[PDB]
Amino acid sequence: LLQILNVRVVGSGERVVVLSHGFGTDQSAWSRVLPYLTRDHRVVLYDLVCAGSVNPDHFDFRRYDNLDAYVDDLLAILDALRIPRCAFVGHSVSAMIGILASIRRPDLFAKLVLIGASPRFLNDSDYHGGFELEEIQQVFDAMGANYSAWATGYAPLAVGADVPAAVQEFSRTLFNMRPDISLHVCQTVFKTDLRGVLGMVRAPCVVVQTTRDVSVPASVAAYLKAHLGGRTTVEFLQTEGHLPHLSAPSLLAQVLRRALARY
């Protein structure tokens, strides 16, 4: 599993930090922010089982029906490495995974930093997630009918800002995902609703908010601050996008250094 999920431990420090990437990327997404953390922290990197960089014949569609199974992997990794305590930085689906894992093992998670984060993407009665059922239905269809056209159109919208190198990079890894696994991950994410368990998180949490995110309405970060059970703050970046580790890595690294200073 250390081998299958490409686990890498880099840097050194008593302060261990786990970087857990989001949909459509692998651990290479952290490469620009990484040099800002390795002097000060021991950094654990890995690829989620759905990443294009993992052999897709490992993907068990049954097991990974549920984000619990991704939490299983993350915990098995940290236990394998004999790490008792860490901070965890999760983008996108990994923000959901970090919430769940911090509830299962509150001893292990000393602090969460959540990027591109939401407890629920679908709208509900007075809950604004940012997506409707029929809208997602059409997206799932497009992923199946022509994955590559879908990915081409989605990449610049996710990056948000006009930063061509970041669009090229996210595209590279989105095109790397096997299209059946990419659809299955999105379907799984869109069936998840963590609203009810947010109060069970005990760890302090920093929610990173950019000025626009296609997948995360502005109102979600305040909702997380009001409902997460630990001491939470919202930290604002002065730029837009869902992937600030790709589009504004120097700015995001300022927030990461401050958030990872003591825990």
- Gap between the Cα atoms of 176 and 96, Å rounded: 23
Question: Which residues carry out catalysis?
Answer: 92, 213, 242
CA gyration radius, the chain: 17
Kindly state the helix (H) or strand (E) to which residue 189 belongs, with its residue range. Answer: helix 179-191
CA atoms within 13 A on the CB side of 217: 14
CATH of the domain at 136: 3.40.50.1820
Torsion of CA 182, 4, 40, 98, to 10 degrees: 50
Any known ligand binding at 31? no
The values of phi and psi at residue 34, to 5°, are -50, -45
Any known ligand binding at 245? no
Q: What is the 3-state secondary structure (H, E, C) of 51-67?
A: CCCCCHHHCCCCHHHCH
Maximal CA-CA distance, the chain: 49
DSSP helix/strand/coil, 236: strand
| Spatial contact of 18 and 89, defined as CB atoms under 8 Å apart | yes
Any known ligand binding at 86? no
- Gap between the Cα atoms of 118 and 190, Å rounded: 11
DSSP helix/strand/coil, 116: coil
- Gap between the Cα atoms of 153 and 43, Å rounded: 33
Please tell me what resolution, in angstroms, this structure has: 1.8
| Spatial contact of 40 and 10, defined as CB atoms under 8 Å apart | no
How many structural domains are present in the chain?
1
Token readout for 96 is: 């959901």
What is the span of the domain harbouring residue 260?
1-263
- Gap between the Cα atoms of 120 and 118, Å rounded: 5
Residues in the chain: 263
Determined by X-ray
- Gap between the Cα atoms of 243 and 120, Å rounded: 18
- Gap between the Cα atoms of 180 and 183, Å rounded: 5
